[PDB]
Amino acid sequence: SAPAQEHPEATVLFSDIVGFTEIASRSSPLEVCSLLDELYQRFDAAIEEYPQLYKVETIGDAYMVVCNVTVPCDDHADVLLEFALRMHEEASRVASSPVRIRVGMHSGPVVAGVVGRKMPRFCLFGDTVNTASRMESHGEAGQIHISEACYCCLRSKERFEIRERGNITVKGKGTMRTYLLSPL
């Protein structure tokens, strides 16, 4: 199995259910798990249309997606970002007791490779991955929180319409600029 490689510029997304602990508040844990799995399967079937993208369902419930690590792209930020929008509408296709997500993206260097022996897994590693994770957990319900590194990697700023700025700290650095994007 090939060694770990460092992709100089890829775009990583995280997504998470809004009000999950509250939804699980009034449901069985097996009820909420199959609610999680249902939403996962809608993402996996919408991601049929986005081949450049790689996704892993993560411990903690976050859905992760990556672009330009599987296949090269350059266009990655843009393709990933449109998929973010698809995620949002596919989130409302699976109601509960309807479902909203929070999405974060970030662009940067990403190390990828295999860990484990009997039980191997593809691994996505580094500061880019970690920051994209705070992007999502510091982002806004129903919206798409994207970093400055990611905004700039867009090859087609002009058809997305990103006006709202924000910030994020995250504790690992100072304060970075971010952009919000509603999907309405």
Added chain:
Amino acid sequence: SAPAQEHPEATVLFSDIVGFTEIASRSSPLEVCSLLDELYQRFDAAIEEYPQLYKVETIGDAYMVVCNVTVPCDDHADVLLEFALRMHEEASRVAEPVRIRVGMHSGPVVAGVVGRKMPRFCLFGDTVNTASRMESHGEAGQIHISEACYCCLRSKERFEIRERGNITVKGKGTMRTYLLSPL
């Protein structure tokens, strides 16, 4: 595959490298990654002696182990606490030396498979989230365990567990916790 199941009592352990940012900043990402995989292979080698245990190296870098979800194991907190002392040992033979922060908690865990073309064994719930918080809220070079996990421990007397006390834990409110130092 069999559907998801709720296991009414299991123990979950998360481990993290202490000051990873200090290590990464002052060297390369492909190298630090090798540091990480070095550690994992040592964990992965020690854990073959602990067949009750199932491990998962997680997307954020945390090494995660669970007991009583795969093979029935009634002293699941005991076995896993013991493996946590082992992890601290395996960590001190990686380079100076690497230190880890370990956290543990016990409770119900849902387990099942998610995904199709690439299925994943999934461990899900409040117990897993809390165990993770036991790690983030713990202490470098030590093992930090919840009261629930102390309770499930059958052989309280085999470990030098000290009561830490009441700390507040993100999302959880007040929890009573315990520490155990290796060495």
